[PDB]
């Protein structure tokens, strides 16, 4: 566990085979307020690479780079560079499918290449995500039960204290806890970069290698993606 | 006539040893064309032009060889109209409507990609029966429903329908609920995909909500984009 929270390992986003020798692998981070696309560019061609630039298609959460890609030295054959690209969420918005899809165009001196990758939604959980208890109860009551979606986190053996701590490290806050007949119930909140609040109730059972995650959100389409995030945080 | 995008420089001269290609796509009387402007910015004359498309999402392929017989002189340009069909080999592209192209002349072979606006692939026979619309809209899982905003549109419902009809997007029903207009629309792609749409127009809201349902929901953003372009042009 690290400050900033869970970072997935880099995955190959653009194979050298699809980009005339250019290989790009990447991941996303959220560190001290700022979001980054952390990439490694590798030149697997026999000629050097220059004139690098990046653009993102419009996307669900308005993600966009905050600065141009600035690689001021030519990327030599077989050379590899780490690139940290700061991002913000004030860019143009277009609904993606899947919801967290990000389409990226990368140009060098050779051509323009395209790829997509999936933004893990945890990088879009804001620090300001701790709901007031009074507001949680009222909001949970009001939100129609049509919006409630349930998930199972399976093969998890952490206690309620450690679950709470790991989730808090990722801006998911536990604002209340209730213990009824061997079962821990954690009431939790988080908030995304676009203002959407998600309310969670997490239930922990003994003899049960799996927890029940119940999510309520006025935009319920995000819920399944929030689940995948919880699972990753608690399995890692 | 439907929406035609302004030509864009698909191939700048400095990337193709003097060869510059400007282009757009058109759909005229049931025929698809790649409309290109070839300019010779080199010092040498150009001959032996030929074009090839890589496999692509919608099976787009030229219907004939490019056939430029007359040589192209330095600083001279020609406007070419290349007829296309959708019976070619298929491969899913990223983004979906990106097309990989190679153009050859006497100097070298050059590679570029361009954007196919999906309206050129909207077929004339795209008016759905109301009965089938209603049953299909209900049956398609709501997880396949995607919603977009057409922002700061200054068009009334009737101009919206007419513009869209000129692009083979059919309004099969128009319903008023509590002041709010709801336009129910259909279109079909050259590959047989039907898209169902509901456009909500609320008086006092210049932002219209477009809801799309399709059994291939991945096409939706591309439909929205050309839909937006049609109403802004």
């Amino acid at each position: 566990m690290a400050p900033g929270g869970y970072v997935a390992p880099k995955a190959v986003w653009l194979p050298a085979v699809k980009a005339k020798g250019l290989e790009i692998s990447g991941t996303f981070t959220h560190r001290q307020g700022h979001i980054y696309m952390e990439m490694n560019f590798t030149n697997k061609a026999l000629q050097h690479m220059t004139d690098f630039a990046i653009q993102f298609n419009k996307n669900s959460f308005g993600v966009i780079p905050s600065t141009p890609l600035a690689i001021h030295t030519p990327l030599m054959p077989n050379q590899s560079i780490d690139v940290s690209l700061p991002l913000n969420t004030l860019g143009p918005v277009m609904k993606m499918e899947p919801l967290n899809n990000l389409q990226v165009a990368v140009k060098n001196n050779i051509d323009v290449f395209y790829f997509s990758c999936l933004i893990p939604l945890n990088v879009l959980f804001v620090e300001d995500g701790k709901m007031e208890r009074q507001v949680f109860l009222a909001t949970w009551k009001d939100i129609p039960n049509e919006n409630e979606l349930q998930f199972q986190i399976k093969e998890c053996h952490l206690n309620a204290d450690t679950v709470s701590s790991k989730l808090q490290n990722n801006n998911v806050y536990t604002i209340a806890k209730r213990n009824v007949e061997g079962q821990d119930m954690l009431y939790q909140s988080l908030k995304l970069t676009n203002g959407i609040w998600i309310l969670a109730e997490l239930r922990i059972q003994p003899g049960n290698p799996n927890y029940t995650l119940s999510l309520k959100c006025r935009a319920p389409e995000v819920s399944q993606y929030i689940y995948q995030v919880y699972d990753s945080i608690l399995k890692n | 006539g439907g929406y035609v995008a302004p030509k864009a420089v698909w191939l700048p001269a400095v990337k193709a040893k003097g060869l510059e290609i400007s282009g757009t796509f058109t759909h005229r009387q049931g025929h698809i064309y790649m409309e290109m402007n070839f300019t010779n910015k080199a010092l040498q004359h150009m001959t032996d032009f030929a074009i090839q498309f890589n496999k692509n999402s919608f099976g787009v392929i030229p219907s004939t060889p490019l056939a430029i017989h007359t040589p192209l002189m330095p600083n001279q340009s020609i406007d070419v109209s290349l007829p296309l069909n959708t019976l070619g080999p298929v491969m899913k592209m990223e983004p979906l409507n990106n097309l990989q192209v190679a153009v050859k002349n006497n100097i070298d072979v050059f590679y570029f990609s361009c954007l196919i606006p999906l309206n050129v692939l909207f077929v004339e026979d795209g008016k759905m029966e109301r009965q089938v619309f209603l049953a299909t809209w209900k049956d398609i899982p709501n997880e396949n429903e995607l919603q977009f905003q057409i922002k700061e549109c200054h068009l009334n419902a009737d101009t919206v329908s007419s513009k869209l009809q000129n692009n083979n997007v059919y309004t099969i029903a128009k319903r008023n609920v509590e002041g709010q207009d709801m336009l129910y629309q259909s279109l079909k792609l050259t590959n047989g995909i039907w898209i169902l749409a509901e456009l909500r127009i609320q008086p006092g809201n210049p932002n219209y909500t477009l809801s799309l349902k399709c059994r291939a929901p991945e096409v939706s953003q591309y439909i929205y984009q050309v839909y937006d372009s049609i109403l802004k042009n």
């Binding site: 165009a105 140009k107 051509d111 323009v112 | 361009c114 954007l115």
Partner: peptide, 9 residues
Amino acid sequence: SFGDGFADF
């Protein structure tokens, strides 16, 4: 634009 190659940049 997005998807229009060199014209994107």
